[PDB]
């Protein structure tokens with residue numbers, strides 16, 4: 212076929228098999244998630260979007276999945292990120308210094324995957340899925356991520372960290388999931404400080420990007436919520452990762 216329904220990529224090939232194998236892998240590795248039955252997890256995931264108009268998905272559709280994937284994360288060890296997923300994950304890989312959402316069962320199941328169904332049909336749509344901008348925002352992927360990102364922000368306490376891409380037009384973007392959802396769902400009764408790490412993509416020296424207009428916006432939004440704001444430049448992401456792997460000795 213030469214003309215698809217939606218303007219975005221279709222469900223990832225072997226989506227059922229992949230979600231299930233990820234659930235097996237995760238539950239075998241993480242002892243706290245040993246009680247999880249993976250078929251019922253798959254079934255709840257499936258029940259959220261199958262037979263449903265892929266432009267009419269709600270947070271409620273994902274409630275059975277949220278329940279089965281319930282998980283305690285150390286509240287003071289949360290790492291948020293925005294436009295810098297690779298470094299965030301390489302970082303938390305080193306010695307579980309922290310957790311990203313993709314280190315939870317639910318985030319781990321869905322990471323890098325696309326999925327949608329069809330109204331009045333129980334088929335998975337492997338040909339196309341709604342683009343969140345071109346088509347509609349209430350689609351299975353977008354709704355999933357909004358819901359889990361929010362619950363993950365709500366679980367944080369004490370010092371929360373966020374990695375930001377210092378080479379973006381807007382280092383902090385109000386229209387990102389981080390800026391539109393997570394910053395507004397950090398709980399001021401629990402969260403003492405939001406500390407931003409601004410990751411330089413820029414060669415060598417470079418500016419004090421903690422002074423960037425968008426970082427000041429972030430500071431201002433967070434301060435008006437009664438949460439403290441902290442910022443640090445990461446001038447050389449290569450040296451940072453090395454220092455995390457091997458603290459001191461090296462000129463860290």
Ligand SMILES: NC(=O)c1ccc[n+]([C@@H]2O[C@H](COP(=O)(O)OP(=O)(O)OC[C@H]3O[C@@H](n4cnc5c(=O)[nH]c(N)nc54)[C@H](O)[C@@H]3O)[C@@H](O)[C@H]2O)c1
Nearest residue numbers: 291292293294295312322343353356360386387388389390
């Ligand atoms: N792992 C993920 O794919 C993912 C997707 C969406 C959200 N997250 C969580 O929010 C933060 C990252 O989201 P965000 O700040 O939007 O950063 P990015 O722009 O790099 O988002 C990653 C992808 O999510 C896609 N995506 C899909 N739907 C949307 C949407 O409705 N609004 C929106 N802003 N982005 C969307 C988008 O096209 C990107 O491909 C971070 O703390 C994660 O824990 C993670």
